[PDB]
């Protein structure tokens, strides 16, 4: 896989560097695509450093290596997009990056408010358990939710949403953890963990 920094945020003046740093990375050729919602994706760099037709000079970058970098100087607002890197593979033909979300404020960063609800007794009487993590009032709209049973991470029964713009011009998102009542009652605590920017908020509920 070709790993990339999940989110990159930048003030309208400064510059932004994005890394594709996988395994092959990729013995020479790398390409970058810009993706905006409901819009057709498009190339912004190929081979390593070549800028296609209609690309302002601020876009740039190349391999170290083994790691390609896309660098955007004097970052404009219309450059807010999800960027993906891509290489050719002998077997898989095409291998893409993990994607990076370049947000470009915008407005001052807002820290997320996390609100965790334990399963209702009613739901437990319906032989269902669901932990509700409500994240709100955060900017930019790129977070990372992780669930913990006691201390062990949890990957099963997790369903998180895509952050939505609010009326506050801020973002909100929810994450749900599904459990059997037996699971819920057998562990000592569950925890919703929300990483926004460099900071994390870990709420925790317990069966009582």
């Amino acid at each position: 896989e070709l790993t990339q920094p999940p989110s990159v945020s930048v003030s309208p003046g400064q510059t932004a560097t994005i890394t594709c740093s996988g395994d092959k990375v990729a013995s020479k050729n790398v390409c970058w695509y810009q993706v905006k919602p409901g819009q057709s994706p498009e190339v912004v760099m190929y081979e390593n450093y070549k800028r296609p037709s209609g690309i302002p000079d601020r876009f740039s970058g190349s391999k170290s290596g083994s790691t390609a970098t896309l660098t955007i100087r004097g970052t404009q607002a219309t450059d807010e997009a999800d960027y993906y890197c891509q290489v050719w593979d002998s077997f898989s033909t095409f291998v893409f990056g993990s994607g990076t979300q370049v947000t470009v404020l915008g407005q001052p960063k807002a820290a997320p408010s996390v609100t965790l609800f334990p399963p209702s007794s009613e739901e437990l009487q319906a032989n269902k358990a669901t932990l509700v993590c409500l994240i709100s009032d955060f900017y930019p709209g790129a977070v990372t939710v992780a669930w913990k049973a006691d201390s062990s991470p949890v990957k099963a029964g997790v369903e998180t949403t895509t952050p939505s713009k609010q009326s506050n011009n801020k973002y909100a998102a929810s994450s749900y953890l599904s459990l059997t009542p037996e699971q819920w009652k057998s562990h000592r605590s569950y925890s919703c963990q929300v990483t926004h920017e460099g900071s994390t908020v870990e709420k925790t509920v317990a069966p009582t």
Partner: protein, 222 residues
């Protein structure tokens, strides 16, 4: 040269997705006509491509689950993805590849992008659970009590509070398409925690698709 795709908005689980993609402002030859998709949890990925001769190249990760058809007559190329699961929920694009050496190559002339969701086929009534008041809420005041509308299909669901007499402090979160194939949203209101025990709070959920109306009373725990 443009590119515009189409297909169903929704696909029932474990069936067979079927899309098509129409080219305009040119001809078919000289380019590998490709299918791709994009979704978080899998990122962007190349599904496959076809040449106007009928010859294909698929993604191994998929493969034996994918079939790409073609038509030179009417400038189109079709995708067929059987045995569909929750992971296949994505934004599907069709694109173009300059026929030649493929290391240097990249996709151009992308389409707008259709959007396929893997669902549960049948109309389902929502289960409405109360979310008992807690605190970490917007100061105090002040508590946040809610309603979990779990396992319904399809959208939309309407959650009002105390029959609409309550508008200030209401946050209804967007739904979640689950591996189940069923949606699920939460609606929380923030109220003065002095008003608990005395003031009554009821969330009014409407799911017209199933003609269901649940008025759930949210009591404090004890």
């Amino acid at each position: 040269v443009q590119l515009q795709e189409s297909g169903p908005g929704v696909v029932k689980s474990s069936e067979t997705l079927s899309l098509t993609c129409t080219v305009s402002g040119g001809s078919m030859g000289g380019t590998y006509w490709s299918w791709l998709r994009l979704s978080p949890g899998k990122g962007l990925e190349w599904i496959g491509y076809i040449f106007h001769t009928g010859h294909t190249n698929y993604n191994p990760s998929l493969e034996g689950r994918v079939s790409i058809s073609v038509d030179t007559s009417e400038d189109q190329f079709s995708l067929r993805l059987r045995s569909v699961t929750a992971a296949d929920t994505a934004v599907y694009f069709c694109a173009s590849l300059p026929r030649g050496q493929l290391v240097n190559a990249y996709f151009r002339n992308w389409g707008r992008g259709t959007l396929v969701s893997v669902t549960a086929a049948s109309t389902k009534g929502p289960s409405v659970f109360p979310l008992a008041p807690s605190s970490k809420s917007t100061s105090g005041g002040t508590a946040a009590l809610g309603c979990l509308v779990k396992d319904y299909f399809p959208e939309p669901v309407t959650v009002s509070w105390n029959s609409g007499a309550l508008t200030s402090g209401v946050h209804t979160f967007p739904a979640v398409l689950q591996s189940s194939g069923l949606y699920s949203l939460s609606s929380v209101v923030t109220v003065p925690s002095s008003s608990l025990g005395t003031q009554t709070y009821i969330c009014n959920v409407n799911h017209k698709p199933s003609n269901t109306k649940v008025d759930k009373r949210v009591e404090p725990k004890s």
